[PDB]
Design an enzyme around this catalytic site. Sequence first.
Site, PDB file in Angstrom:
ATOM      1  N   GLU B  94     -24.267 -10.567 -15.191  1.00  0.00           N
ATOM      2  CA  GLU B  94     -23.813 -11.370 -14.056  1.00  0.00           C
ATOM      3  C   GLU B  94     -23.712 -10.635 -12.749  1.00  0.00           C
ATOM      4  OE1 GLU B  94     -21.049 -14.472 -14.814  1.00  0.00           O
ATOM      5  OE2 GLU B  94     -21.745 -14.619 -16.897  1.00  0.00           O
ATOM      6  N   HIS B 151     -20.868 -16.620 -12.650  1.00  0.00           N
ATOM      7  CA  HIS B 151     -21.647 -16.444 -11.443  1.00  0.00           C
ATOM      8  C   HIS B 151     -23.074 -16.895 -11.620  1.00  0.00           C
ATOM      9  CE1 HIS B 151     -18.522 -13.519 -11.925  1.00  0.00           C
ATOM     10  NE2 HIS B 151     -18.409 -13.472 -10.605  1.00  0.00           N
ATOM     11  N   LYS B 178     -12.683 -19.386 -12.587  1.00  0.00           N
ATOM     12  CA  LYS B 178     -13.344 -18.957 -11.360  1.00  0.00           C
ATOM     13  C   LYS B 178     -14.850 -19.103 -11.438  1.00  0.00           C
ATOM     14  CE  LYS B 178     -14.076 -14.560  -9.985  1.00  0.00           C
ATOM     15  NZ  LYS B 178     -14.207 -13.423  -8.991  1.00  0.00           N
TER      16      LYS B 178
END
Lengths: 251, 259
Positions: B94, B151, B178
């Site tokens: 990521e 991400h 997140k």
Amino acid sequence: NLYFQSNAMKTVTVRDLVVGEGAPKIIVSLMGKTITDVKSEALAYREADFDILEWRVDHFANVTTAESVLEAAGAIREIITDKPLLFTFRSAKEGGEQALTTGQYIDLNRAAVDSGLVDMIDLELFTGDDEVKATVGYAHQHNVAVIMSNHDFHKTPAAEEIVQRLRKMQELGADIPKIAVMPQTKADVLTLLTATVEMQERYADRPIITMSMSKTGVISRLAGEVFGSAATFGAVISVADLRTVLTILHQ
Amino acid sequence: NLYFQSNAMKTVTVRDLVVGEGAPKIIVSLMGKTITDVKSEALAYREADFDILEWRVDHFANVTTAESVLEAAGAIREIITDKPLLFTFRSAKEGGEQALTTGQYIDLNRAAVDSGLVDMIDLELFTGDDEVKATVGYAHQHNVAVIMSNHDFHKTPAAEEIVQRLRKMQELGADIPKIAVMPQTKADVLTLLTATVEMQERYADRPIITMSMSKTGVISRLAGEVFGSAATFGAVKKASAPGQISVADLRTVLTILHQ
């Protein structure tokens, strides 16, 4: 008066101000009832860091007296000499403070154009197509630019509908299409930004001004550079705060 | 060694900082290579206005030496004594600056939990569900909160896919889901904000953190209060990811948007 416009960078240049380039421009409104009030306000705003001065004529008590309007326009232009002056009678139908017949509204705008004291007029999209076309032409004949406006103070139309209104303004000859809508949900704020991006992308060949009203829609007053709105309004969030954020987003 | 959380206020309170209440919180990332660099960076960061300190451990050369990592964490904790410390190894998969095997990554995070020097750890959503659940449990047993992250550095998934990832993080026990995604178009920025609103309004019972990266997505780092992102990343001197603006400028804007 003489203004310029270009379909390259999609700009309108009124005075030395290039609307459509760089960071969004800040418009402040004079809302005085009497010439005393209008003069006190213009003097008070003279030092503020804004770009365009809008006179909200629907707040003016002597709007039906031609010479009073011309007198007040001259008073403002004497105080604020280095900024475009936008003449705006917001109709009762679209949230304005006074009622005028279609004929009075059109003659009022014509008188403003003829005076040579104003750089731009605000004409409402749904005034009537014949009247709008005639008045846009008349303004253009006199080198006065037209911001064409639409408002919905209670809801946010579908993105498609917002885009089609902005497109119609462009077809009627608006130099700068402008729309303000009221969000009822957070999604509605995003709908207004989506329409902004879609218009700017698919149809715009000139600057557009868009806004989602209320505290919920404040983002729409700050993000014009990325999303494609050329101006925003503030009062003297504040004009200082608006310039602060716009400058940060321009960096 | 004790954080709080309220499902109804959708908050997580760590070292007196209430994440999910009021204006979004500012996270800064510390990215030094050696212990010498970590110490000097912590001092430079002490001079800045932020809420949470993230240590980007994947930038640390001696990450494979347990003692070295503990020493660095201790050095940071000695300088930044009153702000939460978030331990983050960003995986190679990521975007991370180095790669570790899944087992090494899990052990690294367990060691951080055991140290007592960090208030929170970051675990990546796609690490491996069984090991993530085990590690979340372990962190919770030692009163360490978990930020779970995902991400996409090359595109923005559909709004519903962003939401589903955030929901999966909640399901796995994340205290704070997140997600960071990269816009290719202006509409992609709006897609990320749409997913944020939908997640926060319909499914979240805790704070979430969302961002659209790059200069094009910077508005997503500023409008968290209205749309529902609880924190945002700013740069002290250098950005830890594309689109971060200065911490000073970030606070200026957040304060304006708060009232």
